[PDB]
Amino acid sequence: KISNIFEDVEFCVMSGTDSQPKPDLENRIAEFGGYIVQNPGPDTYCVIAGSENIRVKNIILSNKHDVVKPAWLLECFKTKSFVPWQPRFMIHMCPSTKEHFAREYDCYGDSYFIDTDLNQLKEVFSGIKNSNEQTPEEMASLIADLEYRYSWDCSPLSMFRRHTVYLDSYAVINDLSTKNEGTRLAIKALELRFHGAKVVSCLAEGVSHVIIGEDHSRVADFKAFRRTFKRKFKILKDKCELQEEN
Amino acid sequence: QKENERLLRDWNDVQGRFEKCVSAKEALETDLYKRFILVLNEKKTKIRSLHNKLLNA
Amino acid sequence: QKENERLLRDWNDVQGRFEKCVSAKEALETDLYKRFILVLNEKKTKIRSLHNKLLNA
DSSP states (O other): OOSSSSSSSOEEOOOOOSSSOSHHHHHHHHHHTOOOBSSOOTTOOEEBOOSOSHHHHHHHHSOSSOOBOHHHHHHHHHHTSOOOOOTTSBSSOOHHHHHHHHHHSSSSOOOSSSOOOHHHHHHHHHHSOOOOOSOHHHHHHHHHHHHHHHTOOOOSSOSSBSSSOOOOOOSSSSSSTTTTTTSSHHHHHHTSSSSOSBOOSSOOSSOOOOOOOSOGGGHHHHHHHHHHSSSOOOOOOOOSSSOOOO | OHHHHHHHHHHHHHHHHHHHHHHHHHHHHHHHHHHHHHHHHHHHHHHHHHHHHHHHO | OHHHHHHHHHHHHHHHHHHHHHHHHHHHHHHHHHHHHHHHHHHHHHHHHHHHHSSOO
């Protein structure tokens, strides 16, 4: 009607009780000139879904339709526009819609007509579950390597993470024996958390530079490591601290 | 003695405070890195593949 | 006093580290966001590269 877009595309207005009631939605749809039904049909291209219950389970098992959240309909109402289909107001979907989303990226939503922005990326990252499931060391090293391939070492703090830099944390390579409640080994152990430098607790063979931590008493230990290794250990005097490289 | 006892607890509290907030930082940071690389690795995968079906035409 | 001097330096190091790590997370989250949208765009450019050249044969 006034929308001129609500024509065609049978709408299954039966689940819109999230916070708004049922009738107002279909009254506004009819004002906009939209189709009304409360059951799946051959012309029913989309089915709205508010609260989630056994009918959603049926449409999941009987995959005749999809799940459409009322936010898209509210956006269409307030803007007088046909908002496209993106994976934020989908829960259940048809397989044909699954390869429709395969056009986007795979199923996450990568519109080739509308570029990615802060909102899309931030909210899909918030929505998508955790990927931190395996050992942090190997995954962080892979992140480091792909960063070095693309020169992505741009963290505001650069002392421990993935920035092709390594910081020693032990006086001798042991079970924190030389710490003995009074050296700076515990602080160095606690320092590997949120900075930027390739995550290696000890014995980094991929970095030729040796940096000296806050423990300046390891200079004899550093020289012993230099004698026992093939890496050149040099004493100090991009980290905004006494730890630096010349 | 009393002042060192409190700041030893304060050091342990801030160690707990530093660890608890930061543990959610890398876990989210390494989530974004891993959620993205699968998109990165596979987007260019069809890019180099579909480019091969170009030169046939 | 040596333990306290360590602990005072311990507390100050973590207190200085706690402040900068919480602040850097807000930047790093946006930093993660910047490097991914450009990649999605740069992949989209080579998606846009293939669409117009498969238009013709």
